[PDB]
């Protein structure tokens, strides 16, 4: 009856909001600069929000758009103080390098000699370097040039920075909060029944791969399938395994790095030669586990296309080399693995010993993904290379009998695969409500 | 006892969440948000630091001009215009959560903030006249 306004400070009410997220990390230097992040609390406080049901929309999330610009800016920051390789854009005299091997695999790597500047501006030098075939083009004789010379400048990565992803934790400023959808069968959109709040997200490695998602987070039940319009064939389907299907990759050739003084203070790191055999870089994935895991994807794909329909896996249908292959980084080199042996299967309405092998090629001059004029030279890695990782998801694409083929050269699809359960909200701690209280 | 944690009673009833206000109060200027380097992460953390003190001081300034400095629960002299909400006391504090309450009171929250503002300015004018003797 007699009711007055009463003010409350610190009431549990929040609103959807965009804000700048800083980085937390655990205790040389990597491109992700995780040494500059605030140390993660060893006790990552998670608070459960009983009786709370929040709306989510992983396809409008700003955390992925913020991480997308962050990682690009981190690479930009890491390549700033390094060496410009514009003197390397010069006429190359190249020959095939040894190993009179299987026909048309000797051109896959080349032995190239060229005239290079020295520490004295007026005195040239004749040096040589081993270059992969994908990093050079012909002139039309045996003359060549670096692949990037007509489109982009090139900057070699400072060889002391590690390309190995370190787990990043994204945090919200004071007065904001991160909400996590703890729904074990969460689509990525809609009212999440189970919700908790966290100061910082879990550890997320900034792994940029294609087709196959590597070293990611696993679902706890079944195997979810996420698109914003699954009935639309132009929206990439993001699948997420619950079991990790392992993959072993290697560059067996024992390379040597040869430093070349191209100027005062500037040194270009060439590929010296190969100690021992010249073999083929490749990846192994157990044929048994990949068939089982490729079947779980089929079961969940059925719920969107019918218990009776037949779905088929085919290989990529063209595009740039990064998107037609399982491209990734391994021990410092950038592999490009043919995946026709992974998506060549037709499944009806209703091995066990060996594994399937994937021939990978290797690039050193890799181009920027959504920009032109900027390109990076990855320095040669010495020794034998071998990395072991799990495939925890895919990036598929429907054509519109159903046929699914991989792809996806958009970095923020990688970040969606980890940030789907997180959402940023701002706290509004002021609340007014009536009660029979009166001042004085 | 209970102690649900930060925002732990966001789904609870307004009367139940209203007893654990200090839980949300202390987390409005801390978090984990020493040299100032202007790296890609360093700029990000600086913005996170300035932003928190900004949004914190806006709320404290409102509590100030309302006469509710340093209070988590202050009572006022603005009567409850039933056109804001014709709900009764029990069907609010023992039924609604602060989130769904804020949803339906949101239109008039600016009207209420003005009445609280001038109620305090007229109140401080009266207290001066009373102490003038």
């Amino acid at each position: 009856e007699n009711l007055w306004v009463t003010v409350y400070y610190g009431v549990p009410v929040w609103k959807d909001a965009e804000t700048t997220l800083f980085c937390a990390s655990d205790a040389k230097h990597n491109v992700w600069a995780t040494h500059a992040c605030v140390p993660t609390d060893p006790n990552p406080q998670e608070i459960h929000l009983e009786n709370v049901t929040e709306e989510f929309n992983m396809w409008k999330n700003n955390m992925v758009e913020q991480m997308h610009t962050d990682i690009i800016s981190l690479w930009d920051q890491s390549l700033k103080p390094c060496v410009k390789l514009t003197p390397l854009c010069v006429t190359l005299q190249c020959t095939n390098v040894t190993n009179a091997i299987t026909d048309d695999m000797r051109g896959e790597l080349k032995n190239c000699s060229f005239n290079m500047t020295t520490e004295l501006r007026d005195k040239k030098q004749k040096v040589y370097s081993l270059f992969y075939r994908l990093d050079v083009v012909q002139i039309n004789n045996k003359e060549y040039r670096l692949i990037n010379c007509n489109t982009s400048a090139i900057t070699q990565a400072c060889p002391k920075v590690s390309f190995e992803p370190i787990p990043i934790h994204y945090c919200a400023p004071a007065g904001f909060a991160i909400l996590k959808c703890k729904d074990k069968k969460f689509n990525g959109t809609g009212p999440c029944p189970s919700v908790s709040t966290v100061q910082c997200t879990h550890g997320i490695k900034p792994v940029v791969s294609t087709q196959l998602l590597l070293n990611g987070s696993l679902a706890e039940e079944e195997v979810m399938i996420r698109s914003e319009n699954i009935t639309n064939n132009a929206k990439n389907i993001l699948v997420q395994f619950n079991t990790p299907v392992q993959i072993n990759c290697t560059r067996p050739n024992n390379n040597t790095r040869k430093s070349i003084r191209i100027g005062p203070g500037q040194a270009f790191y060439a590929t010296g030669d190969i100690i021992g055999d010249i073999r083929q870089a490749h990846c192994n994935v157990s044929k048994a586990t990949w068939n089982e895991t490729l079947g779980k994807v089929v079961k969940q794909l059925r719920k969107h296309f019918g218990n009776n329909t037949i779905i088929r896996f085919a290989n990529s249908s063209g595009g740039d080399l990064e998107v037609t292959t399982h491209s990734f980084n391994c021990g410092g080199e950038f592999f490009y693995c043919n995946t026709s042996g992974l998506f060549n299967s037709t499944w009806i309405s209703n091995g066990s010993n060996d594994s399937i092998t994937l021939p990978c090629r290797i690039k050193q001059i890799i181009n920027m993904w959504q920009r032109i004029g900027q390109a990076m030279y990855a320095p040669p890695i010495q020794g034998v290379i071998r990395c072991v990782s799990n495939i925890t998801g895919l990036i598929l694409t429907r054509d519109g009998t159903e046929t699914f083929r991989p792809g996806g050269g958009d970095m923020r699809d990688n970040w969606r695969s980890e940030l789907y359960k997180y959402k940023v909200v701002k706290i509004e701690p002021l609340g007014v409500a009536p009660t029979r209280c009166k001042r004085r | 006892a209970v102690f649900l944690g930060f925002l732990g009673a966001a789904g609870s009833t307004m009367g139940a969440a209203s007893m654990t206000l200090t839980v949300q109060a202390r987390n409005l200027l801390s978090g984990i948000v020493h040299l100032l380097k202007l790296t890609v992460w360093g700029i990000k953390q600086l913005q996170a630091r300035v932003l928190a003190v900004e949004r914190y001081l806006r709320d404290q300034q409102l509590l100030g001009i309302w006469g509710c400095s340093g209070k988590l629960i202050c009572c006022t002299n603005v009567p409850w215009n039933s056109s804001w909400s014709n709900r009764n006391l029990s069907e609010i504090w023992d039924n609604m959560t602060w989130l769904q309450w804020d949803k339906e009171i949101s239109n008039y929250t600016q009207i209420i903030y003005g009445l609280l503002e001038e109620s305090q300015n007229q109140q401080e004018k009266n207290e001066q006249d009373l102490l003038a003797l």
């Epitope: 049901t53 | 139940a16 023992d94 039924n95």
Partner: nanobody, 128 residues
């Protein structure tokens, strides 16, 4: 708002056991109890029991203590404050003297001294 659509008008004979369905909309199904009330003709209205769609806890009259099975299945989020639930009613040593109209009604408030009080009712179901 709030709706509680009830099942059909079942018709059986003594000895059997029938299930009554109560399907809810327009409100969070977990926040309020579900009450079962009986309006027989040869007696005054009888409160049978209520059950907690959140805690699973149940409470019924001694006249139904070992004769009735009250159950609910988990709700389905529609929006932040709207879900859809269901409540089930069963009788054991059933005769024909239990004939009448059966209602389902949700609780009144989420806290206080009248939490479970049957506030919003269904349209009822005729029986044997």
């Amino acid at each position: 708002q709030g709706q509680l659509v009830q099942s059909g008008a079942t018709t059986t004979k003594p000895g059997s056991s029938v299930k009554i369905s109560c399907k809810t909309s327009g409100y969070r199904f977990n926040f309020y109890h579900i009450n079962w009330i009986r309006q027989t003709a040869g007696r005054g209205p009888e409160w049978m029991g209520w059950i907690s769609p959140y805690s699973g806890d149940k409470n019924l009259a001694p006249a139904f203590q070992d004769r009735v099975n009250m159950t609910t299945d988990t709700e389905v989020p529609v929006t932040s404050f709207t879900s859809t639930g269901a409540a089930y009613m069963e009788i054991r040593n059933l005769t024909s003297d239990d004939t009448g109209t059966y209602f389902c009604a949700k609780g009144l408030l989420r806290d206080g001294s009248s939490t479970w009080l049957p506030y919003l009712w269904g349209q009822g179901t005729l029986l044997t």
